[PDB]
Design a protein around this nucleic acid. Sequence first.
DNA 1: ACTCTGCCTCAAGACGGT
DNA 2: TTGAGGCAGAGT
DNA 3: ACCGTCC
Length: 335
Amino acid sequence: GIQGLAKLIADVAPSAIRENDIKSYFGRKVAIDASMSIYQFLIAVRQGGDVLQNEEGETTSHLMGMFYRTIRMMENGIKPVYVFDGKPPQLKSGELAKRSERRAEAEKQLQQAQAAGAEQEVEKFTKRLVKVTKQHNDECKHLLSLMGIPYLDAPSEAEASCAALVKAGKVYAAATEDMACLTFGSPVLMRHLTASEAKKLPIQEFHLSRILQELGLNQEQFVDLCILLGSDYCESIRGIGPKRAVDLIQKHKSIEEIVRRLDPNKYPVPENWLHKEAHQLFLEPEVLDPESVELKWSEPNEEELIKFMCGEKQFSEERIRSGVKRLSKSRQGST
DNA sequence: ACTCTGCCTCAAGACGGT
DNA sequence: TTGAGGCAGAGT
DNA sequence: ACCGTCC
Ligand SMILES: [K+]
């Protein structure tokens, strides 16, 4: 994430966002952040406050979500490649650790809810306690393998590896809600791509070059701006938000300069501010080699699919086999 | 009055059958 | 996790 | 569209 970046671009660079109907992404490949979508499902796919599961106790909401949305996308001519998060950059420790503490917090607030009724709390805190695990990951990779859908492991940050794939032309765009993908230099970002039957929000397409033009910056100044707005990798200056940050970056072009010209009594900066290191992470992140693996959208293995989902995970053979045929079908073509 | 902060709420997908 | 949106209040 | 259920 980059705090407020979406609203900012809407506000001061509206020409950088197009809204298109899904019909116009027909025949395009997109890169998807696996870990974020798995998360979205673990949160949303709930039956009675609880997550879907086979009786052995193993979770399955993520498998549901992934299987079906993937199929939908494929039907609409959208070939998705899933990129899985690698090892988090050191600069991320801070953010990550906060995320642990809050979870611990939630967990305590779980007990005091359970021992006092009102499942409103129980389910709220339970949602706040959601966490993607290496198991979730391994399972989804298996599923995608048996669906013929290609997946890649990012050495570190998935978003950075997505931006790398779009840069290299291996895909048209990155489909994610994480504005940071632009910071890492991805020329095109697509929010709200679900290929879902109930629509909801219109697909949003962000062009990086348009953002740059409309804001009057180059990529480097744009990274600095995102750092000021609020990145996952270092702190921000208290009291400088979107409006002020745009002003300052437009006037002084860099963080060093900005820090020289700032009144240290009105706007004091953070102590031991790793902003230069963050910046360098954004310009030169560790990413996979987009030329190593040639992405192929294979044919589903229907039998093995039934064995895995239906067999191991108690999925209705009819719903599954139906999905498998919609997908095998969409491979040869169609609507 | 503009801006930011921080504390809060609240919600989070897809399908099949009407 | 991400919003959007709500509000009080401090600080300009 | 609504909504009961998917597991
Ligand atoms: K800030």
